[PDB]
CSV table of C-alpha atoms in Angstrom, one decimal:
chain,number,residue,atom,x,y,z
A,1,UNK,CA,-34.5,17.7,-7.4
A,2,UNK,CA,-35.1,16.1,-4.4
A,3,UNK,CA,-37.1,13.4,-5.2
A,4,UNK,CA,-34.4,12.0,-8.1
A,5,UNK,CA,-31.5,12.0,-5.4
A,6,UNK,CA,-33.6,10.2,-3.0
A,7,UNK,CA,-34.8,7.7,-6.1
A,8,UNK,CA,-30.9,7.8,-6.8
A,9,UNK,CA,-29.7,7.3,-3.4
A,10,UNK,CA,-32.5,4.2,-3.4
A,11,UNK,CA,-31.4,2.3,-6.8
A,12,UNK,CA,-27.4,2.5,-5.9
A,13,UNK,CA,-28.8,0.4,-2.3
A,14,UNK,CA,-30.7,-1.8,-4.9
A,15,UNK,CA,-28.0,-2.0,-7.3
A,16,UNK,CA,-25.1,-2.8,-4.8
A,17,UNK,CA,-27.1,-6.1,-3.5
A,18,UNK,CA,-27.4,-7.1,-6.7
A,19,UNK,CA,-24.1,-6.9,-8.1
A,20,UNK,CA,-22.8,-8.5,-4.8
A,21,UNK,CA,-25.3,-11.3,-4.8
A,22,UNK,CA,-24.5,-11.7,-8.8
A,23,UNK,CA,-20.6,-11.7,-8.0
A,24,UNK,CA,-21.2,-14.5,-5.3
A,25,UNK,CA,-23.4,-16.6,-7.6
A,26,UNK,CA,-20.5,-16.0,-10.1
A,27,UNK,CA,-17.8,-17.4,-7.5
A,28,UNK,CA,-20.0,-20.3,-7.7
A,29,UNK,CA,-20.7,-21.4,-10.7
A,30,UNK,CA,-18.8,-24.5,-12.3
A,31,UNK,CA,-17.8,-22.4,-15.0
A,32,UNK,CA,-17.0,-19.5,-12.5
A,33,UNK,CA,-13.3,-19.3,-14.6
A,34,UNK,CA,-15.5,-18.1,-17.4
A,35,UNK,CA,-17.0,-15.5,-15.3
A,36,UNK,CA,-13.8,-13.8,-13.8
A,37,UNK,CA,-14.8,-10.1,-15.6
A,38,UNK,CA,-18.4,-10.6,-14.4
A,39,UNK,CA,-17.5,-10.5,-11.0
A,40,UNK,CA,-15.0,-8.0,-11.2
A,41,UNK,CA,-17.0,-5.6,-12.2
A,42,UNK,CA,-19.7,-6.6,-10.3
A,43,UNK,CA,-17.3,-5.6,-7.5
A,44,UNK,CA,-16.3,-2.6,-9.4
A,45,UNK,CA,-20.4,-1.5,-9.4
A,46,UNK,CA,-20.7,-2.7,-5.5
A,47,UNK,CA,-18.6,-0.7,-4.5
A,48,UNK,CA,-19.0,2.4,-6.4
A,49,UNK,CA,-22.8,2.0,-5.4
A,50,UNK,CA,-22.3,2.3,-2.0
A,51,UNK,CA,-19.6,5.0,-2.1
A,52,UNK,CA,-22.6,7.2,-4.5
A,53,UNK,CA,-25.0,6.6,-2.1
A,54,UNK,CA,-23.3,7.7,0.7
A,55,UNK,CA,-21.9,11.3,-1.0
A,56,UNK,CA,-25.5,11.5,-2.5
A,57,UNK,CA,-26.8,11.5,1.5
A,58,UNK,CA,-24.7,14.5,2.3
A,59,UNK,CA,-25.2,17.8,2.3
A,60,UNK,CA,-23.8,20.5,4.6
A,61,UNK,CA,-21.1,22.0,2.5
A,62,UNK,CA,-22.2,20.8,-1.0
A,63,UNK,CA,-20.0,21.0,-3.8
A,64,UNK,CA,-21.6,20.1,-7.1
A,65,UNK,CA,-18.2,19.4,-8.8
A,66,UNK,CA,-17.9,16.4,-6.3
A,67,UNK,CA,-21.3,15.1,-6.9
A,68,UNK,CA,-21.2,15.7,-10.7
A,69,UNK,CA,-18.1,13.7,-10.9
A,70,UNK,CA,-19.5,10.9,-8.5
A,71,UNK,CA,-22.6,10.1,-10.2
A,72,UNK,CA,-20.8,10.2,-13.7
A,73,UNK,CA,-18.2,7.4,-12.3
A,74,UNK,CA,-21.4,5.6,-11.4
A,75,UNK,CA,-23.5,6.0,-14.5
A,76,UNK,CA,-20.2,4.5,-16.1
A,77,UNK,CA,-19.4,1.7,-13.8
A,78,UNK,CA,-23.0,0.8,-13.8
A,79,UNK,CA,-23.2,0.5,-17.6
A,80,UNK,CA,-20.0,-1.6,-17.9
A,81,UNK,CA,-21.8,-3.8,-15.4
A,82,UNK,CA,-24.8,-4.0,-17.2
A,83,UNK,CA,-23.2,-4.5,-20.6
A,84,UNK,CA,-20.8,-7.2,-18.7
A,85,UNK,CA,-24.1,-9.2,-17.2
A,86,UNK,CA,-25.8,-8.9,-20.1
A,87,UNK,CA,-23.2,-11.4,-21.6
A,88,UNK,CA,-24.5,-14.3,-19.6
A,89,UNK,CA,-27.9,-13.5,-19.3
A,90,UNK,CA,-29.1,-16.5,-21.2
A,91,UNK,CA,-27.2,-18.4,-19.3
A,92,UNK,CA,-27.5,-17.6,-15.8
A,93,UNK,CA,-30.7,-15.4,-14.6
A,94,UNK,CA,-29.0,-13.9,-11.5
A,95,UNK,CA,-27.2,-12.2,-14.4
A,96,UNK,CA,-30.2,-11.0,-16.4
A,97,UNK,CA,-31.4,-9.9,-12.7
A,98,UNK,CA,-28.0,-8.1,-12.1
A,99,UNK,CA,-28.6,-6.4,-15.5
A,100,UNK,CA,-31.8,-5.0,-14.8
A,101,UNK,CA,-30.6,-3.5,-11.1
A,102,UNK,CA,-27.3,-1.8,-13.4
A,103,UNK,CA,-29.9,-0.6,-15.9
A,104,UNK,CA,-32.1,1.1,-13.4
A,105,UNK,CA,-29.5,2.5,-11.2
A,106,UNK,CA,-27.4,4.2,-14.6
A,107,UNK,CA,-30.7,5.9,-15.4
A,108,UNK,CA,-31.0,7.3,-11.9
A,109,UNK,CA,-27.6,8.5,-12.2
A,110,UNK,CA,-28.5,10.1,-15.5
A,111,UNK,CA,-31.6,11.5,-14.4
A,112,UNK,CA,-30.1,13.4,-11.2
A,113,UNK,CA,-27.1,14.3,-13.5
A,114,UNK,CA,-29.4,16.3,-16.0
A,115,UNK,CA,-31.5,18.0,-13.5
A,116,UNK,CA,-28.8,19.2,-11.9
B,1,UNK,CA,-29.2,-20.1,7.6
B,2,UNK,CA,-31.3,-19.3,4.8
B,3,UNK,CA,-30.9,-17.5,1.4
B,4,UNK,CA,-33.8,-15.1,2.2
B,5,UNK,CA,-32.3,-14.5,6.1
B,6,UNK,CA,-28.9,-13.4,4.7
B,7,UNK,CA,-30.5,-11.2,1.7
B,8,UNK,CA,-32.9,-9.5,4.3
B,9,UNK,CA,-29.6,-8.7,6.9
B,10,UNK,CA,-27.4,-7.3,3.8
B,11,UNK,CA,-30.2,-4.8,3.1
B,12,UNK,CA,-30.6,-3.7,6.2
B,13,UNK,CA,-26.7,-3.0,6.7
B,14,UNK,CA,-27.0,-1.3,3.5
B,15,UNK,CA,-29.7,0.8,4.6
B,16,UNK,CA,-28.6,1.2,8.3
B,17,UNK,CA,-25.0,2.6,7.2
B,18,UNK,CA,-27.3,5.1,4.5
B,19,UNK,CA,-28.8,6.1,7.5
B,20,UNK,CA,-26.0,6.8,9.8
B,21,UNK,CA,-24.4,8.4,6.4
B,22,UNK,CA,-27.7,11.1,6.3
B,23,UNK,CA,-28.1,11.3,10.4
B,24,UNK,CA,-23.9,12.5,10.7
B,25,UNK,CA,-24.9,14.9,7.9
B,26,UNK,CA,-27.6,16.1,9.7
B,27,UNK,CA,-26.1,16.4,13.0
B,28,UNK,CA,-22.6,18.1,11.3
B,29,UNK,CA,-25.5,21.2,10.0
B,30,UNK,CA,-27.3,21.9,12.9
B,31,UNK,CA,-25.9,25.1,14.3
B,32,UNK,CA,-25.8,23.1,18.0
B,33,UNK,CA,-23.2,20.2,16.5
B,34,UNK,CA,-20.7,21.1,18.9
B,35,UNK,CA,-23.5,19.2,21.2
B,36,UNK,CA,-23.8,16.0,18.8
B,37,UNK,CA,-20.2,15.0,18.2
B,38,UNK,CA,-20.6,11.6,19.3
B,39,UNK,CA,-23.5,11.4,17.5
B,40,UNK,CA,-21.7,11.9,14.2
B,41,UNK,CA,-18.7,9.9,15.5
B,42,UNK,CA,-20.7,6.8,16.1
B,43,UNK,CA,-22.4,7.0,13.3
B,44,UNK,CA,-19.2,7.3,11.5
B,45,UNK,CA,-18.2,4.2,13.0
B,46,UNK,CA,-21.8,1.9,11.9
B,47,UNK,CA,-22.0,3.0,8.6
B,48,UNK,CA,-17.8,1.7,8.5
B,49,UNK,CA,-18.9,-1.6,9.7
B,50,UNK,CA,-22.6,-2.1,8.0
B,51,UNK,CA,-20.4,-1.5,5.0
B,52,UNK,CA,-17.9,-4.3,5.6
B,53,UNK,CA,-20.6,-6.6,7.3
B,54,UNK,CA,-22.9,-6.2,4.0
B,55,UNK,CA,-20.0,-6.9,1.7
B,56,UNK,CA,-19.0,-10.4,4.3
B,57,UNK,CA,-22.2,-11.5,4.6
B,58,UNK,CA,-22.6,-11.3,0.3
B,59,UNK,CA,-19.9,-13.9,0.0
B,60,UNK,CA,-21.0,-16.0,3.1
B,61,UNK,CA,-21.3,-19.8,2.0
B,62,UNK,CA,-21.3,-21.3,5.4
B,63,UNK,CA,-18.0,-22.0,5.1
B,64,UNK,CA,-15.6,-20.6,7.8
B,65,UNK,CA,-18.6,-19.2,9.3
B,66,UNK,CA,-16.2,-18.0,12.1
B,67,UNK,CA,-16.1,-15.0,10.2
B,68,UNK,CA,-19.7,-14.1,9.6
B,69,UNK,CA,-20.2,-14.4,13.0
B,70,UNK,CA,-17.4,-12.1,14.6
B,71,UNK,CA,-18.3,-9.8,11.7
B,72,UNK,CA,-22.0,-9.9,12.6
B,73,UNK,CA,-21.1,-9.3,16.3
B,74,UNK,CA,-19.6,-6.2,15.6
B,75,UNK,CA,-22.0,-4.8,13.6
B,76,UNK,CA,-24.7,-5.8,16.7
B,77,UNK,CA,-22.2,-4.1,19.3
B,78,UNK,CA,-21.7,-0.5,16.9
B,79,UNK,CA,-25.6,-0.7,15.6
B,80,UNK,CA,-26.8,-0.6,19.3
B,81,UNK,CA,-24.1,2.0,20.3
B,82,UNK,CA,-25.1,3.9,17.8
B,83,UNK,CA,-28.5,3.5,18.4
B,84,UNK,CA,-28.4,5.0,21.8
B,85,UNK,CA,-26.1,8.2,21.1
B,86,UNK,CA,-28.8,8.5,18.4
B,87,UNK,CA,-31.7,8.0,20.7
B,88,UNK,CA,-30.3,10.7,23.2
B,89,UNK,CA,-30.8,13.4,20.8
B,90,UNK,CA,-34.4,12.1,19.2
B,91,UNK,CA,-36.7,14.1,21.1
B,92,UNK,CA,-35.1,17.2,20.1
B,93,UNK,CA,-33.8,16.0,16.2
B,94,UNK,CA,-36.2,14.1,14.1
B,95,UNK,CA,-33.7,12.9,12.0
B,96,UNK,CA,-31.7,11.1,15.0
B,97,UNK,CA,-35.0,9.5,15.8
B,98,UNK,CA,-34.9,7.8,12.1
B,99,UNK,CA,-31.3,6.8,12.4
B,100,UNK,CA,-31.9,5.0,15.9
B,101,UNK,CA,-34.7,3.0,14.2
B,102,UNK,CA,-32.6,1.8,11.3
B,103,UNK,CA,-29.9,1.1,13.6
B,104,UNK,CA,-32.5,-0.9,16.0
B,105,UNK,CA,-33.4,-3.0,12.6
B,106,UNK,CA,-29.8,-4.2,11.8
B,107,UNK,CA,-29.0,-4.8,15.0
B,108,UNK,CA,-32.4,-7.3,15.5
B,109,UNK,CA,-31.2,-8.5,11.6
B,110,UNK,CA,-28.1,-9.7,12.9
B,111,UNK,CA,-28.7,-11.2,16.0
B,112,UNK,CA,-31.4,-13.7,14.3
B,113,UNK,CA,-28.6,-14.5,11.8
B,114,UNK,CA,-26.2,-15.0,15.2
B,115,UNK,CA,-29.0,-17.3,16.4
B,116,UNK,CA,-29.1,-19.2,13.3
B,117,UNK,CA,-25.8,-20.0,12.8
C,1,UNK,CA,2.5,-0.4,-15.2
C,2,UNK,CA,1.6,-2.7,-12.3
C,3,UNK,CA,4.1,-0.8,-9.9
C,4,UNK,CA,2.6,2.4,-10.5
C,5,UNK,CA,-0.8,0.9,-10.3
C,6,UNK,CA,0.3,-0.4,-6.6
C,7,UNK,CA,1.5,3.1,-6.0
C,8,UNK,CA,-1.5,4.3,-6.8
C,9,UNK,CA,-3.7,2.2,-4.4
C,10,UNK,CA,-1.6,2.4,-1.7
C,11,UNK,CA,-2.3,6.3,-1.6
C,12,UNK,CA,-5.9,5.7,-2.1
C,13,UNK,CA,-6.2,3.4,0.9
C,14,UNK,CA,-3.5,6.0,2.5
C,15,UNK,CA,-5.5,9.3,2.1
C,16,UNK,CA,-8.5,7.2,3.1
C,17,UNK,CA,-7.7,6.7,6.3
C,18,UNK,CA,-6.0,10.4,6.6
C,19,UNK,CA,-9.4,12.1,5.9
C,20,UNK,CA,-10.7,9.5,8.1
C,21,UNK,CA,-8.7,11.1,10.6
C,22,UNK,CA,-8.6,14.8,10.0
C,23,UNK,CA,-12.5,14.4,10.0
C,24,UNK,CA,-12.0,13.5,13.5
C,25,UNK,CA,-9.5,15.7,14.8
C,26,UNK,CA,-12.1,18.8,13.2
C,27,UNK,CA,-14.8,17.3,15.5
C,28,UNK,CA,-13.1,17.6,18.2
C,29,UNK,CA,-12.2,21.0,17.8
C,30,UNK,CA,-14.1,23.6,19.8
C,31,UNK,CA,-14.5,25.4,16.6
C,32,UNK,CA,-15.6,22.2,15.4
C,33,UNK,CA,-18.7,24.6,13.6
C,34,UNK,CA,-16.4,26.0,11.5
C,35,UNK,CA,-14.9,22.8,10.0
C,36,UNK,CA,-18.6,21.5,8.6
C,37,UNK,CA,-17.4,21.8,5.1
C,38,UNK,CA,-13.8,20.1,5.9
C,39,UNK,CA,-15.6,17.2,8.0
C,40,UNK,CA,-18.3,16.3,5.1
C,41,UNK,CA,-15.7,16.6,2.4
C,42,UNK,CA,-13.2,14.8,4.4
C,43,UNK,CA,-15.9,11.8,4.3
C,44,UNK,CA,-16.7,12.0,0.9
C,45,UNK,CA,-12.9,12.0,-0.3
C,46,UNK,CA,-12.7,8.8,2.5
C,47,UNK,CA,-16.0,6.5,0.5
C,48,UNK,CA,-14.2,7.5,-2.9
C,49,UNK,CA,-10.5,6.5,-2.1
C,50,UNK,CA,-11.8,3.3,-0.4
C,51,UNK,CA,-13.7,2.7,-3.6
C,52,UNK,CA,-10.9,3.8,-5.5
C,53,UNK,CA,-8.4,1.2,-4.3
C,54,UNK,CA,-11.0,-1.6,-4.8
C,55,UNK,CA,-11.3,-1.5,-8.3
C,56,UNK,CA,-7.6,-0.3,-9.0
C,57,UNK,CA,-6.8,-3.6,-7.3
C,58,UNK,CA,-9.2,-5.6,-9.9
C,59,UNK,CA,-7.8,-3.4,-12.9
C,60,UNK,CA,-7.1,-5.8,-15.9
C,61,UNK,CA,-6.5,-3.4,-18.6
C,62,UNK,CA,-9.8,-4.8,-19.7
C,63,UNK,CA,-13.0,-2.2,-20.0
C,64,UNK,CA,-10.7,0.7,-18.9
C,65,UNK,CA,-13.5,3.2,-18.8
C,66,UNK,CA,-14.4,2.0,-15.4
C,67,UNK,CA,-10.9,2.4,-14.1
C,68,UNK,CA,-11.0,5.9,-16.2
C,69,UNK,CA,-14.2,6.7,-14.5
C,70,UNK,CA,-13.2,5.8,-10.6
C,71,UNK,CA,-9.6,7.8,-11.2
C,72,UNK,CA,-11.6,11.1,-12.5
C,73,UNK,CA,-14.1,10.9,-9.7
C,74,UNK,CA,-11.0,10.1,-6.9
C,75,UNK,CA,-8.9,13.0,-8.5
C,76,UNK,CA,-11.8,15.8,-8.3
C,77,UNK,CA,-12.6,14.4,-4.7
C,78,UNK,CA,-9.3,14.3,-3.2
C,79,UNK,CA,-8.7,17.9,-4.8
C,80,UNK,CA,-11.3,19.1,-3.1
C,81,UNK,CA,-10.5,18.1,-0.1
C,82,UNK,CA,-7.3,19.2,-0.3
C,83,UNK,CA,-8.4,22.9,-0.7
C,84,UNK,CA,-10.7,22.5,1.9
C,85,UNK,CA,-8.1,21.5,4.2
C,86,UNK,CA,-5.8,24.3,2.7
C,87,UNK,CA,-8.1,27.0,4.0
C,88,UNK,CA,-7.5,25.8,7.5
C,89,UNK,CA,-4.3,24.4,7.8
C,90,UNK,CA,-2.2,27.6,9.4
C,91,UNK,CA,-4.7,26.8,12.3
C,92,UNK,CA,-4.8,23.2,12.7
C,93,UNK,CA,-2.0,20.7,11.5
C,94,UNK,CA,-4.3,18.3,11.2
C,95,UNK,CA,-5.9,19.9,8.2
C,96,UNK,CA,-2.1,20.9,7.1
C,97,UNK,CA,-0.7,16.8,7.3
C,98,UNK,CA,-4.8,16.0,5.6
C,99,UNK,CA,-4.0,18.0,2.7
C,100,UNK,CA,-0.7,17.0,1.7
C,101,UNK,CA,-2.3,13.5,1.5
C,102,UNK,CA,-4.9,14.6,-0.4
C,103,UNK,CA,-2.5,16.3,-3.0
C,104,UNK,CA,-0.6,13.4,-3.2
C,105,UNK,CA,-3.3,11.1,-4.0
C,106,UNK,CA,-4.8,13.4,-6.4
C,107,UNK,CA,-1.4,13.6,-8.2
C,108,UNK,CA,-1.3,9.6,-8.6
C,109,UNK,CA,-4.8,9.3,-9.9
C,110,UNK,CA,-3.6,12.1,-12.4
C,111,UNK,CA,-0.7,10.3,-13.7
C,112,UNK,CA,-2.5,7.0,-13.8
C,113,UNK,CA,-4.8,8.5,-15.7
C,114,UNK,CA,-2.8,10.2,-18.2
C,115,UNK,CA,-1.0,6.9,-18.9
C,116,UNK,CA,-4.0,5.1,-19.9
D,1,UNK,CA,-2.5,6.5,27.0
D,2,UNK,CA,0.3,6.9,25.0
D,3,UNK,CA,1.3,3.4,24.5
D,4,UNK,CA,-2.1,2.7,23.5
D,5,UNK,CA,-2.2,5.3,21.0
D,6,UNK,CA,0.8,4.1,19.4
D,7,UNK,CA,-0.4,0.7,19.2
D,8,UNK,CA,-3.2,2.1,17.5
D,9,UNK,CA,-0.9,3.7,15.2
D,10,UNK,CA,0.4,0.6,14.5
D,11,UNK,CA,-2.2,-1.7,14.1
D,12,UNK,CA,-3.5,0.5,11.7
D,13,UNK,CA,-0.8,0.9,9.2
D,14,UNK,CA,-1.0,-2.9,9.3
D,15,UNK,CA,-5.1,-2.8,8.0
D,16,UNK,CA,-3.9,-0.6,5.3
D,17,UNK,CA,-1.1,-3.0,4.2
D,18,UNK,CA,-2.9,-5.6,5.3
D,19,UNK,CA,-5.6,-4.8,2.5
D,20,UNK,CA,-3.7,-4.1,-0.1
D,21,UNK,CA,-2.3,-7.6,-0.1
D,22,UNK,CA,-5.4,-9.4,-0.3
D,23,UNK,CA,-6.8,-7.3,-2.8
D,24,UNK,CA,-3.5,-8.1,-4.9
D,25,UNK,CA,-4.5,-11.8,-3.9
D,26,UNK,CA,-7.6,-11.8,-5.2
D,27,UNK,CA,-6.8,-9.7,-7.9
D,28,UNK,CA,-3.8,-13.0,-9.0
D,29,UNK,CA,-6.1,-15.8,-7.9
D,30,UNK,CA,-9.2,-14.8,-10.0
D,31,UNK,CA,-6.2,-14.6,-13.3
D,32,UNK,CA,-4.9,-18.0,-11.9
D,33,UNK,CA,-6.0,-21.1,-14.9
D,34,UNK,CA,-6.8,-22.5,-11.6
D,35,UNK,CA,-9.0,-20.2,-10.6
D,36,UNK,CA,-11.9,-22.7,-9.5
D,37,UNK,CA,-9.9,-24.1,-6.7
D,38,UNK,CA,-9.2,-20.8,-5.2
D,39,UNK,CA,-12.6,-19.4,-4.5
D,40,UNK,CA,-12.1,-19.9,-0.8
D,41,UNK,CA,-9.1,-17.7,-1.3
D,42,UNK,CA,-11.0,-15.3,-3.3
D,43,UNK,CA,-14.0,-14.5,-0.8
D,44,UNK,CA,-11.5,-14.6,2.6
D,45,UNK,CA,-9.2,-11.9,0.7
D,46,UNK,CA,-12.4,-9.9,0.1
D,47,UNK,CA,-13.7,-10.2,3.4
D,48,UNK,CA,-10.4,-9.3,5.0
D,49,UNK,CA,-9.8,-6.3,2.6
D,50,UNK,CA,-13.3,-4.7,3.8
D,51,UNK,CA,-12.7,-5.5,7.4
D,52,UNK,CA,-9.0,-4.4,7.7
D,53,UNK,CA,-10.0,-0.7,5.8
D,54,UNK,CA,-12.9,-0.6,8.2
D,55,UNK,CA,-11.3,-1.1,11.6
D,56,UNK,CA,-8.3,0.8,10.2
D,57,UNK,CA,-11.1,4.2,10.1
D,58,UNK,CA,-12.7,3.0,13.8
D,59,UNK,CA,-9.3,3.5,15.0
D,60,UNK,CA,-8.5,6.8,13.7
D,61,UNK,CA,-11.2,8.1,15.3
D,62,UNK,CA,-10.8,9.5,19.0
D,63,UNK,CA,-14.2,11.4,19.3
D,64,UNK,CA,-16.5,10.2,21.7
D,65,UNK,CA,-14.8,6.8,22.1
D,66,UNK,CA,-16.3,3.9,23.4
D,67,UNK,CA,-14.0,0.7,23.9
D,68,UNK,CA,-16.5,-2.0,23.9
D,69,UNK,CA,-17.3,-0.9,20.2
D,70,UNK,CA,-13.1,-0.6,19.0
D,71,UNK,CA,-13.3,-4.1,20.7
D,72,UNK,CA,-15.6,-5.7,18.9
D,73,UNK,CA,-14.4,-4.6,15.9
D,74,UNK,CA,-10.3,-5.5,16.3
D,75,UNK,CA,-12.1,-8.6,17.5
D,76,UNK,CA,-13.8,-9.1,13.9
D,77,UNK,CA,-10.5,-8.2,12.5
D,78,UNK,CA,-8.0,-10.7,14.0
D,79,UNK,CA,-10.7,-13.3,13.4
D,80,UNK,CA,-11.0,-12.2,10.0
D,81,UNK,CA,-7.2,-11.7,9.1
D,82,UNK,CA,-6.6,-15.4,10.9
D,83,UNK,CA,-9.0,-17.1,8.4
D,84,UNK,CA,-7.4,-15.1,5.2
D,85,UNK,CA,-3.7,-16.2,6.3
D,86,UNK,CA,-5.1,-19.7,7.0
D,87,UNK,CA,-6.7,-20.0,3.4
D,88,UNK,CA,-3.7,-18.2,1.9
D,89,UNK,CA,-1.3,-20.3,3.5
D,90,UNK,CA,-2.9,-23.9,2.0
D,91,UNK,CA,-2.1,-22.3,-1.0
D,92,UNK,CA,1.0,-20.4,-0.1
D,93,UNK,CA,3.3,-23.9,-1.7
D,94,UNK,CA,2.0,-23.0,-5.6
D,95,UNK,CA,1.6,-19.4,-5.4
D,96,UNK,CA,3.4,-16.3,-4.3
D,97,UNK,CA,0.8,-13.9,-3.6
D,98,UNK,CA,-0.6,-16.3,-1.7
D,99,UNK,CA,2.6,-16.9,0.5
D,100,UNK,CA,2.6,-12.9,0.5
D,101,UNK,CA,-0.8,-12.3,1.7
D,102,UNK,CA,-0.5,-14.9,4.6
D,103,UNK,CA,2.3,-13.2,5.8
D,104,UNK,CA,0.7,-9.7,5.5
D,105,UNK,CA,-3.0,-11.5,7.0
D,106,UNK,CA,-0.5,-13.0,10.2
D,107,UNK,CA,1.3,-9.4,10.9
D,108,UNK,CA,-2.0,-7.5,10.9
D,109,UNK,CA,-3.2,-10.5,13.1
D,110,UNK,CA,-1.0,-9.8,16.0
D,111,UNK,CA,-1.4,-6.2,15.9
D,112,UNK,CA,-5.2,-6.6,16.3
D,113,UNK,CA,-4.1,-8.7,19.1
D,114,UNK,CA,-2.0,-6.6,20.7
D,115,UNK,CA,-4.8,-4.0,21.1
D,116,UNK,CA,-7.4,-6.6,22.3
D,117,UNK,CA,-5.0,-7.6,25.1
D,118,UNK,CA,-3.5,-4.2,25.4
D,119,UNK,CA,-6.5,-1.8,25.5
C-alpha cells in the first residue's frame, strides 16, 4: 500500500517536530522538574520517528520482518508518548498539540502494519 | 531569530535527510549503481547531519548560539555537496532531480538562519 | 542492571558505526551490485542502533514497553544484518568483522530484554 | 594517508565514547532534585550526543570523499564537544557525571582537532 507508507513516512516527519518542539518547551517550563518523563519520551518518539521514516523510505532488498518490527516499536513508542502528553494537556497546549501529532502518527503505523 | 524561522529550518532538515534517505535507495537499485556511488555516499552523509542539525536546532534557545551556527554550517556545506553529486545524475534519474531540490531548500533554510543570527 | 544497560548501549552505538562502515567498504566494491541488500540493510541496522542507544540511555525503569519495544526492533534489525553480512563474508572481511558486530549487539538487546 | 586514516580511527572511537557520556549526563541531570538549574547541561549533552554519532558515520565513510564536507563537520564537532565540556565543567564541582562528561567532551575535542589541523 503505497499510499499508507508514504502517509506513514509523512506523520513520523510530523510527529518527530512535534515531540522535539514539546521536549524543548518541556526543558522550559518553570515546572520543567515535573516534566522529566514528558520529555524523555518525547525523545524516545523523536528519535524512533526519524529512524521509521528512514527504513520506511527504503527499498532495494526489502525485508518485511525488519519493517514489521520497526513500525510496531513505533506504534508503541508513539502511544507511550501520547498517553505521557496527554498528562499535561490541560496544562500546557504544546502538550495537547504533541498528543495529537503521537495520535496521528500510531494510526499510520497501525494502518501500514495491517495492510501489510 | 524567530520561532517560525527555526520551525521552518528543522522541517526542512527533516525532509532533506528523508530525501537523501529515498534518493541513496534509489541510486543503490538502479542496475547502473556502480556509476552513482558518490551519489549514495553523499547522501549518506546529508541525511547524517540534517539529522543532528534538526535535533540542535530543536533545543536552540539562543544561548551558546556558537553551536547552532557551526552545526548550521555544516549542514549548508554537505546539503550543497550533496546537491551537486545529485544534480550530476538528474537528467538521466528523476529521482536525483528531487533530492537536489530538497537539498537546494535546506541549504537556502540554513543560510537565512546563519544570516539571522 | 545499570552496568549491563551501559553494556548494552555501547554496542548499539558500536554496531552503529560498523554497519556504517561495512556499508561503505560494499560501495566501494566493484561488485558493489551484488552487495544492494547488505548496503540497505546495513543502513537500516545503523538508524535503529542509533535510536537504540538514545532511549536506552533515558531508560528509567519507568513505562518499560518503550524500552521493550526499541530492544525487539534493534534485535530483529541487527539479526538481519548479521545474516546478510554472513552470506558474504568468505569474500570480503568487511562483511565478516560487520557481522560479528551485529551478533553481538543482537545478543545484548536479547539479554536485556529477557531481564526485563 | 595512513596517518590520516588512523587519526580517523581515532577520533572516531572518541564520538562513540564521547556520546555515550553525555547521554549518561543527561540521562543523571534530568533525575538530579536540581534538575532546573541544569537545563543548559541537558540540551549541550543532547546536542553533542547527536553531533559526535553523526561525525563519527561521516568518517567511516571513504567512498567518494570530499574534505571540505569531513571539515565542516569535525568543525561542528569540536565546537560542539567544547561547549558540552564547558557546561559540564561549571557543574563538574557538585556532580560526577558531570566531571565525567567534561572529560570525555575535552578528549573528543582534541581529536576533532587533530584531524582539522591534520587533514
Amino acid at each position: 500500500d503505497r499510499e499508507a507508507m508514504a502517509r506513514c513516512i509523512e506523520e513520523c516527519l510530523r510527529c518527530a517536530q512535534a515531540c522535539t518542539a514539546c521536549a524543548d518547551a518541556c526543558l522550559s517550563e518553570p515546572t520543567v522538574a515535573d516534566l522529566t518523563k514528558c520529555i524523555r519520551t518525547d525523545m524516545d518518539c523523536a528519535d524512533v520517528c526519524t529512524a521509521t521514516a528512514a527504513v520506511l523510505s527504503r527499498h532495494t532488498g526489502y525485508d518485511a520482518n525488519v519493517t514489521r518490527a520497526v513500525l510496531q516499536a513505533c506504534a508503541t513508542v508513539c502511544a507511550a508518548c501520547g498517553d505521557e502528553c496527554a498528562r499535561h494537556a490541560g496544562m500546557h497546549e504544546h502538550c495537547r498539540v504533541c498528543a495529537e501529532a503521537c495520535r496521528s502518527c500510531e494510526q499510520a503505523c497501525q494502518e501500514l502494519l495491517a495492510g501489510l
